[PDB]
Subunit: 197 residues, 4 copies
């Protein structure tokens, strides 16, 4: 099976999580894992001025989504929605939609916020789009044990992995957060192999 | 693969839809399909005095959901949520939750409304509960081409089959609506057999 | 203005929060604040066996909702939805709906979960019901400063106050959680007076 | 009270609805109503080559939203979410967020879809972003009695006005749809004047 980890990141938090997801997915022997990013939509000079992080990942086209058996979407929260960059990208998949190109493919979502609020809503509002495409939606439930831990501040929900970046973005993803992100990649990649070989 | 079509119906619209879903699912070679209702929560006298319909499907126990590979949930809308009866039943699946009994099982959802409003929210808000169980969520997308028919008042969304019951319940599910419901059963059953034999 | 704090609680967490909400609302000079609970739906012996907390609050009827200018709804999460008890109660407001009895009234929601997951979804799925009734929906945004604090585990979202009860229910609402709950009561009661006198 | 009707439209359906909303709002004594569009994000050549409609409403700046007492947001659906253009615009309101510039302001939402699917999700998922700003959210409930008309294909939900554009965009908003949209403007404007003068 081919698994795409398709993300948007301004400051690197989602990018770090995406690498944890790909690393989890890679544990699955029949799974070929690819990590790509959506295009930046901001002017490059404003991106740079805002202290945006440069990223090595190749840039995806909307069309190449059809080449995968499973897509794990990563996006920071913008007021409890996916980011304008991710939304802009998915608004270009009308050709794919009209030809049934993602129908029955697997979809899963991870997210990042500054102080936690909106992390659930970002994921489940992304599911809505995946559903219009007839994609099978993969939540993580409570198989990741770190989800039971209330002793430290941490991202992660039954809908998908998440990280808390802090108000100023100074937090890095915790071990527990990355561990849930690895689980998500393992689980979705296992389902992709199970369905598609 | 074993498929449970689990429903709540007061006046029989969801019951008709549940039957159509079961029929679709029964077309799939390898699929064993069962239809059950959740218990009524209203006082019996009040259910009867409001005109509740008597139904021949047996009543489910929470425990027995662990026996299926796929569960297709049918509920009428109560102000854009699942019914109290369905909610109350699901609130008794905490033991299943703690043991991971529904984890990784296929889940799908159909609904009914008086005049259409709330049908999407009913389905997607049901998905949330399915996700806490780690169930794999199956929307229908636009494969059912009746979804493109805007020439007549018609239930059905990319989230799941729906029907429009009328303000007073006098409408019966239309043939287009029943087609989409049969498609949903067949598609979910097909997936269950692919994954489980 | 008359403000109802209408809650469901099994183990007292929502009940403690409801008192914080009423206490906040009481700061508003033109506001008359009442705290009521929805009926338990469980058999009394099973409630007691489960270690359910006895509560002094009077029990509301669905009809008396029409007597208030603002209702602040409190419910524990059941898999990212409101509780079967709250849902059952609201399923009895069809008379109110058909006569426009809650149209333009204010509505706001607070919540409680064991380990945090589903707290946003419980609130926004409750909003859906409030919207069918034409109620004006009151989120809290980020006026409660504790919402910026990521140094300790804590409930509270831009949608409404929340508390983390712990997996076994052994956590009590924190000072920061109760403080956000007080803000919610102040703010909604102030809006109710502003609109209705 | 000042009312902004802020919209995105590609082919003019939401533009027609925005106009109907403004008209309704203009009927309210004391209400100053303004209509603006968010910037186009597509390359101009591609917007034109797809058949985008040229529009006489001026383009909004994020900053100017601080000048209104009520903002009625209009967006077509993109797979059950607001459009990329609207999302991108809202993603530039972070400065407004940090200063509480929209806090406590009235917010309301209308939408458009090709065939109906996603219209509810588009609206409620827009509400989430409004809540992070602390805006007071206004659904329409069932006051617009056309919402009870199941005799004809008809947009509109208790969440907000909607229209059905057809698969190819050839449908124009119907008189019932336009009535509900005018009702929404008038109702939100009435509320703004009650609260703000
Ligand atoms: N918040 C973090 O995770 C984080 C991390 C590192 C640094 N920072 C610092 O925070 C400061 C700014 O805050 P911020 O970036 O969190 O949010 P912000 O909303 O204040 O601003 C980022 C800038 O980019 C613009 N912008 C954001 N999305 C856009 C889009 N889709 N299209 C066009 N313009 C868009 C905004 O209008 C803004 O001017 C920066 O100076 C940066 O160094 C924050
Ligand atoms: N809408 C239909 O499909 C339909 C069909 C036949 C008859 N009717 C009639 O229309 C009238 C009302 O229609 P309706 O039933 O659609 O709406 P409703 O809300 O007015 O009626 C349901 C009745 O049962 C109660 N009820 C509903 N769910 C409950 C729950 N979970 N727990 C406790 N009580 C609950 C309500 O309080 C109410 O008394 C009734 O008199 C009924 O006889 C409607
Ligand atoms: N979770 C907490 O906040 C908390 C607090 C105090 C004590 N406890 C302890 O946890 C144990 C049980 O766990 P639990 O209550 O968290 O969840 P649970 O799901 O395991 O069970 C509570 C019992 O009530 C039933 N139940 C719950 N809602 C119902 C409804 N709407 N209608 C009919 N039956 C319903 C369940 O089926 C179950 O048998 C108890 O023995 C209790 O002492 C938990
Ligand atoms: N649906 C209508 O109201 C309507 C009206 C007139 C013409 N058409 C025609 O139908 C065809 C497709 O219809 P459609 O436009 O509804 O769907 P579509 O998705 O197929 O077409 C939109 C075109 O613009 C692009 N696009 C859309 N949003 C974008 C964004 N935010 N950023 C970058 N690119 C974006 C898409 O990639 C595509 O190339 C077009 O050829 C168009 O001329 C449709
Ligand atoms: C426009 C905008 C909206 C935001 N909305 C929220 C929010 O609703 N909740 C939150 O906790 N953080 C919010 N933030 C913070 C971002 O989600 C955070 O910076 C992001 O998760 C970092 O991920 P990244 O480093 O990969 O870009 C917002 C930031 C911006 C710029
Ligand atoms: C409490 C209550 C809430 C309802 N909420 C809605 C609603 O939000 N939208 C709608 O169109 N119909 C609503 N109705 C109608 C029911 O959804 C409808 O009668 C039901 O779908 C019929 O299905 P059934 O025959 O299977 O019971 C409501 C009815 C009741 C009693
Ligand atoms: C049926 C059921 C479902 C539950 N679902 C969740 C959940 O999704 N997320 C969570 O963190 N806790 C969940 N819990 C924990 C309850 O939300 C928690 O016990 C409640 O918030 C305590 O509030 P109260 O003391 O007022 O009753 C669930 C508990 C039960 C019994
Ligand atoms: C990227 C994309 C996604 C779309 N998603 C949906 C959808 O989920 N449901 C639907 O009925 N129409 C969908 N359509 C149709 C648009 O919602 C419709 O053309 C629009 O509402 C017309 O409004 P406007 O003329 O104001 O642009 C989509 C179109 C595009 C380009
Ligand atoms: N069968 C499994 N194999 C590996 N990890 C699992 C499994 N089930 C749950 N996990 C979780 O996956 C995450 C990563 O752990 P690991 O896969 O051991 O590096 C943790 O949250 C574990 O609790
Ligand atoms: N104008 C205000 N008056 C009182 N409390 C406020 C106000 N604005 C925000 N708050 C918040 O309300 C909560 C309770 O504080 P207090 O009202 O001072 O007991 C805290 O979260 C404060 O940050």
């Amino acid at each position: 099976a081919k698994v795409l980890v398709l993300y948007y990141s301004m400051y690197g938090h989602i990018e770090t999580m995406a690498r944890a997801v790909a690393e989890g997915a890679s544990k699955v022997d029949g799974a070929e894992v690819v990590v790509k990013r959506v295009p930046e939509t901001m002017p490059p000079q404003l991106f740079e001025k805002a202290g945006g992080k440069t990223q090595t990942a190749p840039v995806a086209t909307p069309q190449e989504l059809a080449d995968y058996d499973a897509i794990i979407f990563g996006t920071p929260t913008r007021f409890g929605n996916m980011s304008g960059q991710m939304r802009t990208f998915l608004d270009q998949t009308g050709g794919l939609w009209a030809s049934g190109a993602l129908y029955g493919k697997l979809a899963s979502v991870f997210s990042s916020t500054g102080t936690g609020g909106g992390q659930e809503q970002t994921i489940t509002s992304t599911w809505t789009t995946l559903a219009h495409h007839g994609m099978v939606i993969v939540p993580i439930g409570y198989a990741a044990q770190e989800l039971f831990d209330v002793s430290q501040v941490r991202g992660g929900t039954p809908y998908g992995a998440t990280t808390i970046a802090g108000g100023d973005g100074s937090r890095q993803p915790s071990q527990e957060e990355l561990s849930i992100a690895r689980y998500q990649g393992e689980y979705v990649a296992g389902l992709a192999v199970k369905l598609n070989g």
